[PDB]
Nucleic acid binder design. Structure first.
Lengths: 66, 69
DNA sequence: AGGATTGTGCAATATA
DNA sequence: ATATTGCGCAATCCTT
């Protein structure tokens, strides 16, 4: 129907639940996007650390010549 | 009005656009989830390499430390 | 008995 | 003009 009070209450409650469900789905989607940004920055940091450790190892091993 | 031909054409075109837009958004979310798996595998590879090189550097520094002046 | 999910479409808004 | 976004609805699924 469209007039009964049981119907109006059911719609009011469902509209709350539908919005809650859609907000939750949107939040999960955004969280996945953020995770990509976080991992990309972290992999960039770790790669720079690899390069730094390699430079320190090379510098140390050069001491064997002198 | 809401029964005119112009209204019907606008809504039919928009409904097509809505499905196209939401399909693409769902596909992007699928690609993003795949990217997380790929970046996680790369992260684990990098963590292993950093740990290996850190140990290699620590042992070599300790070797030089045991050298007499 | 009542919330959570979802295919669908109206509507407002953003964008080109 | 199309693209994006929020929402209502009703059917449906799941909880209590």
């Amino acid at each position: 129907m469209k007039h009964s009070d049981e119907y109006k209450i059911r719609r009011e409650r469902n509209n709350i639940a539908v919005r809650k469900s859609r907000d939750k789905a949107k939040m999960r989607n955004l969280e996945t996007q953020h995770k990509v940004l976080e991992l990309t920055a972290e992999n960039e940091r770790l790669q720079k650390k690899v390069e730094q450790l390699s430079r320190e190892l090379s510098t140390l091993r050069n001491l064997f010549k002198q």
